[PDB]
Amino acid sequence: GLPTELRPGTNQFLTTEDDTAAPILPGFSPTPSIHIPGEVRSLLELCR
Amino acid sequence: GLPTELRPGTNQFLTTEDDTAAPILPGFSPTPSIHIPGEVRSLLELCRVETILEVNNTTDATGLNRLLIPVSAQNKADELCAAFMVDPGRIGPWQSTLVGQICRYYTQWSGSLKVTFMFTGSFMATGKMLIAYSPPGSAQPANRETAMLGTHVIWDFGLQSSVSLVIPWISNTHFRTAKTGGNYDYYTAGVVTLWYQTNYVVPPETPGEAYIIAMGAAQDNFTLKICKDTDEVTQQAVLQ
Amino acid sequence: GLPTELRPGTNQFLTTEDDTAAPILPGFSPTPSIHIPGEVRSLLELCRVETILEVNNTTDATGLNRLLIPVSAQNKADELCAAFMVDPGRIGPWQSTLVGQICRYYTQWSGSLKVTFMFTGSFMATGKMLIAYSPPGSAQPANRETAMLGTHVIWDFGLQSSVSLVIPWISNTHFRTAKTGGNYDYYTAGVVTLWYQTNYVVPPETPGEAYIIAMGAAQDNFTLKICKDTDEVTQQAVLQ
Amino acid sequence: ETAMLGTHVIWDFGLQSSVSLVIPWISNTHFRTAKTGGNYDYYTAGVV
Amino acid sequence: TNINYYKDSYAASASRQDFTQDPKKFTQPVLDSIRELSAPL
Amino acid sequence: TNINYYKDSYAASASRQDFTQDPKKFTQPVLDSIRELSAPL
Amino acid sequence: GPECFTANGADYRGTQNWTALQGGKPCLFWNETFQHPYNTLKYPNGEGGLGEHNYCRNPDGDVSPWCYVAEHEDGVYWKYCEIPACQMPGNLGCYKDHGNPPPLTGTSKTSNKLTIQTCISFCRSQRFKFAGMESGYACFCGNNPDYWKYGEAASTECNSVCFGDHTQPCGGDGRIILFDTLVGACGGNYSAMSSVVYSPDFPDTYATGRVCYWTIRVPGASHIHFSFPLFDIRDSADMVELLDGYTHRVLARFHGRSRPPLSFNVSLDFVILYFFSDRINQAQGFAVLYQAVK
Amino acid sequence: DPVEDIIHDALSSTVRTSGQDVNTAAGTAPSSHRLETGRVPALQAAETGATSNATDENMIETRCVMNRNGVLEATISHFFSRSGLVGVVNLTDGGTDTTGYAVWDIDIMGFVQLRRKCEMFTYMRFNAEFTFVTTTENGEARPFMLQYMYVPPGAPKPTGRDAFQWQTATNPSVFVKLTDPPAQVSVPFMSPASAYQWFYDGYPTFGQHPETSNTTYGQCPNNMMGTFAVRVVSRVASQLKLQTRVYMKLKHVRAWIPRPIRSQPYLLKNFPNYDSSKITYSARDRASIKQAN
Amino acid sequence: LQYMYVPPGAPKPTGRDAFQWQTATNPSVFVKLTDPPAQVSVPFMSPASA
Amino acid sequence: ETGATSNATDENMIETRCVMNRNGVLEATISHFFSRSGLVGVVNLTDGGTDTTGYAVWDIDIMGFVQLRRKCEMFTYMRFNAEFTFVTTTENGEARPFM
Amino acid sequence: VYMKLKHVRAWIPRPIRSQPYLLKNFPNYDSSKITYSARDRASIKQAN
Amino acid sequence: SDRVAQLTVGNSSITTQEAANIVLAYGEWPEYCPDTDATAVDKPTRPDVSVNRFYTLDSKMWQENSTGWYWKFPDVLNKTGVFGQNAQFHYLYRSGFCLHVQCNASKFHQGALLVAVIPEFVLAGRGSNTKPNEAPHPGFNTTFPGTAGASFNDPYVLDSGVPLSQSLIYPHQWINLRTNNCATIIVPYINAVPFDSAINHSNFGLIVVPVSPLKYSSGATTAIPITVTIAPLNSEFGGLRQAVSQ
Ligand SMILES: CCCCCCCCCCCCC/C=C/[C@H](O)[C@H](N)CO
Ligand SMILES: CCCCCCCCCCCCC/C=C/[C@H](O)[C@H](N)CO
Ligand SMILES: *[C@@H]1O[C@H](CO)[C@@H](O)[C@H](O)[C@H]1NC(C)=O
Ligand SMILES: *[C@@H]1O[C@H](CO)[C@@H](O)[C@H](O)[C@H]1NC(C)=O
């Protein structure tokens, strides 16, 4: 195989990292959305 | 070597992931296939074919007669022949059709459903029938003048003894779920009820009873959702 | 480092995987080769060469005479000289040929098989023989008029004393498996049987018995399947 | 189940109450003769 | 885009999913392809 | 397409499989290449 | 001697109530075990040793003696019982196979309707005094006396059914059973002391008109004591005759109408067992047991 | 030309349902009332065996819906993509059991939940992805090592713990530890036939077949595909009660000839024997006919 | 450990040796306790649109 | 008798047919015939109180075990590269924290 | 200790040894027990 | 204009006037073995007329309390017809059948019939015992009834543990005594192997189940029979050998 080494910082469930995870339902199509008013996209939108 | 770190989610035999595994016979050629009919490629392909409902699923109806609803002449008109809840995932008649068995393997279902009704009476005996689907809400109606209001199809006998009703997919949401009861009856899909339109009029020297075969299936817009272990297996002993 | 996760199937010394390993002598030049005859590149190359069958594999036939079938004149005609089951993986005569030994290393086999029959009789003694392959079904036939019906080859003596029969690959499936017995005899490939066509006619002052050497091999369409530990080794003690 | 083996025609009733069978001309020779009996039954043409 | 780390074919996972549905094999397996809204008999 | 992570040759697994069969080396190792359907003697 | 004569354990009515000597299960009594198919309510008057006990019997026609036991979710509702006493004379036990070299290095064959006696008819046709089955389809003759080379094994897992008849065992896959050739035959001479004389074509039904003469010539024996543990004759024309050897004289007669006693002493030194049968209707078989006491 | 009868059929012996690729759900167009005779889609003839094509547009005043519901998850490829239990072994390596090994013949019919899925299709063809989870009877993992040899049909089966078959110079084997994530192996379609068969309306052999007990019935060997053995890697016995489940996935699946779903409970492994005394009726029993719950 | 998702309508497990753990359709996570935490992505599986 | 193989092909004996075969010969070549790993030797490093050596030497001889031996006996001269694998365990099959 | 063979090139095929092995570096068999390759049958014309 | 029907194979020529709509199993006609897939290296045989006839099985009478019947294919034809004498002499076999079943009744009678082919129609021992060596099993004559065709014992589960309610996934056609007195199916060769034995492996079954019971007012024909006429198409045979009965 490819040679490699594990750096530090492994096996740590970081609360705020952003990685992939195994999909649980392979080949899944969600319920298609609907145009709903009031779509907020920021919290600064609510501070104003 | 290349530096790396193991994220969480390792060493977990996920039942439904899709990864490679080491080939066990390296450099292997399989037995070449053969063109065989009946190659199915989808389960929606099997929901579009009719199978009989055990609509007469009553005590004192055992044997083969569960598949047949009786039909006799009615001296008094405005009579109720039969009725059944259309919910496939729910228990009831749809446990005997395929589309209700295969729906149980999934959670949610959508799309229109259709039922046919083959008449098995004599050639000379004739009669009109009213097939009324009622959307959800109250229970099944009391008299046919209350069951009119849903989508209904009126049926005349003669040749070509199989009419088709199609229950249109009406629902607030995009998908109803198969489980029904408690609060999941919010996804109930109404009740189909069959009424004597006029009568079962018979000539002399002919049997004054008959039967109808209620066959059901799914319309072309049938679509399904995530998988689910069915309920019709409760193996206790390991098979030896 | 790069993020990653270990899927299942790790740390497993799979006997048949195909991966790299750390070179033990870094920067090594081997001894340069030399052009040597007999470079084989396939095992099918070895199935196409004849080796003798121990068709006379009987009690009271010990020594070298297991490789030879007797042939004598028959006062009464319509006589059975010999017979053997064609199944190579099955025990029997094919344990002594290579193609039956090498087939045991694999599970399944396909392709036509062929057998030759060299005559070792005198030059003046002559005779006709019938070599009949019977497909599967019933057992070996009783009389030759029942063994005709399979593919058969009639043989005349003279010069050029080696005829060739080829058992055509006939089977419902694409591959028979080497194991035979129980329910695996569904993959049985019939029986080859050799009959006296006319007689072993001998002149005076000549021995009235002879022998035939049954040599077998595989036809060009011989193809094999996944590997298998053979049966002809049962080492008990470690070799010291 | 022994009379199947010849050429046979199966008939259903209903309207159009006349079916047609045709006995095909099968014979070793080109012409059968009208006389039948003795050795002239060599020209017999079967039985319907 | 799916990739296989071995030179065998049967180590892939979902190498080609396919949409191909033929209701005519099972739902209408009829010689005389009946009309869509007419009288069959 | 097969790849080696070392600068030596003998760390590869199946670097080139090959179909090459020569039955004439063993099955018919004859001077006078006999005819395919004639009398050899 | 054995408490059992036939190769399944039907006549076995032993005192064993366990299912094994090592690691034995306390077996449940036949009179509470009613959810299982065999009990004593719908079986009155003891069809197959059934009563108020927990002894392993064979009321189903199976290949072994067994009973019914529960489990701690690590067992099946029955269990084959191992009894070291019910090994019929003519059974050399069952042994584990290994491959090459075989213990019986005689002639090996294979069929698909192989019952037991078809091999014993085959090793007798080749004068090999021991036989061998492998998992109901394979035959294995041979004269070798070193069958014990690989190891003795229990008689429980040696019980894969024969393909010929589905009521008797023909060993296991990789496990051999060994039956002698003197049984399952007739004729010959018995110079041994206390051997066992079985029916022609035992365990099978005797064939259509099997007529043959046994010979028991013992040197200097005072009296010969016969017995009839298994003796079931159905047609009257099928008879068994104990003849004198010197003068060819009739001494006793048994057939389907004259039932046998327990035993009776035959006080001579050279006796002949004569057997004659009919073509039409057959019966199970008979087993006897002589004791030359000087 | 010599005779027309032989060239006519041979020329006319040539080959005698172009379905489209459906990516989404089926939409619908509107429809108005139509009051005309001669044209009726309701009054079909289900007696011909055909499905009635009474589409929704042709019955009621429908609307226009451009659907978007995905049909991806309903195909057979992702219907069998789930792994599932197949067998358990009981490698009871202790003081009493002087074997040290346990052999188990591969039979997926042993457990119902995976069985009932593949019964829907009579002929299947696929590649497998086996997974051997490993543990003790207490669920505990320990520092030990196991061996997992596949023993094809005809191979010598292992005889004990120190057997020579574990030399495995040809048989594929998996050497794995018990403190390890589960071993996972892909397996190809290794049938001698062209496709697997869960059913066989006959016998493997020729000859007579009795009518009192037919144990050879319905046993095709093309699917019967050998055994699979396990030992702990040790020449002397370590006292532990082991029990390893084996799981498989089905990939690259191709089905054929759909079969109804079995409703009655299973009683045996290789035979679909039900019980006449307890016929499990598929539908639940209702009160009367006109009392939909 | 074993971690099976039991959707609505599925048979719920009854005990430790239950047949529902055969999980031929239900997604399950088989994981060890000496393991970094198991992590799984889950889609929007509502019957509704939101 | 000339030592040649008879070339009596199937077409030349019987009324054959047309078959365009597809059975793969990939797995029968020598490259994938020896690709299987296999046992070669065992060592007995009996490190204890009695045995005051602490080491065990083993000369490489693949002839020691039959199942790999009988394969390479089929070919008189061979040339290859090897991929050794040293599985490690105790007599009880137990793994331990050692080096 | 286990080994694999890769990049193999053979030469001069040799028959397969049938007799059991007795030594390591010498192919010594035993004259007293010649293991016959084929299993012993009943007679010549009795294919099992 | 559609009720009539004329099928003629071989020297036979069947006609039905009231029944309508031929249903073809799975939308593929019966065809010969292609060159690129066959394994039997020898030439197979194509009689195409002697064997491709409409052989008629025996009549089975329908009573008001009847249960059902079934057959097996090509098992029903091994003692009769040239096809019988062709299957006993050949190890290999391939054909595609043209089923056709008839049930005549008056316009005053009532009743229906489910006709369906069942691929690989195994049967099931009818017993609660799970002892492996004492397992109930169907006899030979029960699973291979021959030309006569045995009856069911519990048709609601097809004597195989499969509910009849779902039995329409298979190719089928309903006989219903108000509109059609007959039915027909054209089925191809369905087998995972290109050829098979003819006296060991039955390719498929056939079921004729009285779903709706025959009911008539008293004073009419009481004995209603059922006949099935069968006809192989594109038959094949290979591997000639001696006779084999079973
Ligand atoms: C060393 C690797 C061990 C894993 C390999 C074991 C062999 C796996 C072959 C899979 C064969 C197809 C799946 C088997 C299904 C059923 O057992 C049979 N079809 C009939 O019962
Ligand atoms: C530190 C690495 C340890 C592994 C290296 C050990 C040396 C391996 C050399 C392999 C030589 C060829 C294979 C040997 C085969 C037989 O032993 C000999 N041909 C004769 O017995
Ligand atoms: C077995 O032996 C006798 C009865 O046969 C009795 O004394 C003993 O307690 C029995 N044991 C069991 C476990 O039933
Ligand atoms: C059942 O049999 C056992 C053993 O003989 C006996 O102890 C018990 O009293 C019996 N019970 C009944 C109800 O007969």
Author numbering:
A (entry chain C): 1 to 48
B (entry chain C), C (entry chain C): 1 to 240
D (entry chain C): 145 to 192
E (entry chain D), F (entry chain D): 28 to 68
G (entry chain E): 29 to 322
H (entry chain A): 2 to 17, 21 to 297
I (entry chain A): 150 to 199
J (entry chain A): 51 to 149
Which text from the study accompanies this structure?
The icosahedral capsid contains 60 copies of a protomeric unit composed of four proteins, VP1-4. Enteroviruses are unique in harbouring a lipid molecule (pocket factor) within a pocket in the VP1 β-barrel, which lies below the surface of a deep depression encircling each fivefold axis, termed the canyon. The binding of such receptors can trigger pocket factor release and viral expansion, leading to externalization of the N-terminus of VP1 followed by VP4 to form a pore in the endo/lysosome membrane through which the genome is thought to be subsequently released. Here, we have determined three cryo-EM structures following mixing of CV-A10 Kowalik strain with KRM1: the CV-A10 mature virus, a disassembly intermediate A-particle and the mature virus in complex with KRM1.
The CVA-10 particle seen in the receptor complex is in the native (mature) conformation and the model comprises the same residues. Receptor binding has minimal impact on the capsid structure; structural superposition yields an RMSD of 0.5 Å for Cα atoms between mature virus and complexed-virus protomers. However, there are minor conformational rearrangements in some contact regions, most notably the C-terminus of VP3 and the VP2 EF loop. Residues 29–322 of KRM1 were modelled and two of the four glycosylation sites (N45 and N59) have well-defined density for the first glycans. KRM1 binds CV-A10 with a relatively large footprint (~1400 Å2) and the first two domains of KRM1 (KR and WSC) span the virus canyon, each making interactions with both the north and south rim. The KR domain engages at the narrow part of the canyon, contacting the C-terminus of VP3, EF loop of VP2, and the HI-loop of VP1 from a neighbouring protomer. Notably a loop spanning residues 98–102 in the KR domain, disordered in the high-resolution crystal structure, is ordered in the complex by a strong electrostatic interaction between Asp 102 at the tip of the loop with Arg 239 in the HI-loop of the adjacent CV-A10 protomer, whilst Tyr 105, Trp 106 and Tyr 108 in the same KR loop make weak interactions with Lys 140 of VP2 (Trp 106 stacking with the side chain stalk). The WSC domain of KRM1 binds the wider region of the canyon, interacting with the VP1 EF loop, VP2 EF loop, GH loop of VP1, VP3 GH loop, VP3 BC loop and the VP1 C-terminus from a neighbouring protomer. The CV-A10/KRM1 complex we report here demonstrates that relatively large non-Ig superfamily receptors can attach directly to the canyon and drive uncoating even without penetrating the canyon sufficiently to make direct interactions with the canyon floor.
